[PDB]
């Protein structure tokens, strides 16, 4: 929809979401970074 609002909504939640997963991700890249 071209008429959707492009500006950011300031009413978004500014607090940290405690329901984010506290477990460490096993899917992180295990290879050394050449960059």
């Amino acid at each position, epitope marked *: 929809d071209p008429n959707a609002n*492009p*500006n950011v909504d300031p009413n978004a939640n500014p607090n940290v979401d405690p329901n984010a997963n506290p477990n460490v991700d096993p899917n992180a890249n295990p290879n050394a970074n050449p960059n």
Partner: antibody
Amino acid sequence: QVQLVESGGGVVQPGRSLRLSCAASGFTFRNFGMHWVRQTPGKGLEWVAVIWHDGSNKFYADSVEGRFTISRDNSKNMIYLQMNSLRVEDTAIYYCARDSLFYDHDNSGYYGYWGQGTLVTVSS
Amino acid sequence: QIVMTQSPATVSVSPGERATLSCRASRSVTSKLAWYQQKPGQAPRLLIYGASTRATGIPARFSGSGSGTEFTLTISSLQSEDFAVYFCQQYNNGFTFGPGTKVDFK
């Protein structure tokens, strides 16, 4: 003092590519979405493209669909419009204008602050 | 999308008189319509946004009204600096602009 300055104008031959840059200052750039407006004598104002606050969603007009590319760099506060394969119908004054004066969820798409504009001429 | 027209093309109104402009859209645009001020050599300036609300710094002299497919822009007492061409835009479905109505001295 929302100041928008347009550059990258000039004269180019048909079938080539030109790049327009629009520098924005006087407001939080990354929190708003910018547009591109075309003014052709004998036709009036014509919309070109719109970009989101982070460039996630881009919408172009039919007359420029598939040929013009809009982009933005929030780390430099600049708005770009890449016009590839320009034609003789693209000669007009191009305006960089911000969407809305302030945030209103149900009111967006009108232009609050306009730039002085740059001239791009396509001819042989 | 929505074809936009303005009538009449030009108006001849002496300073201090009331000037009225009419804007008509092919399809309903509800309450999403803006007016712009085009002076020769100058970028458009936002006068009225949505249906009637006025941009900050715009004097109360500029008054907008209308809804649906009929919108009007009325100047209560036209001054010297307001002699220009006004553009009517919808942003309900797409982004289209009107042909433009120029205000001229009588």
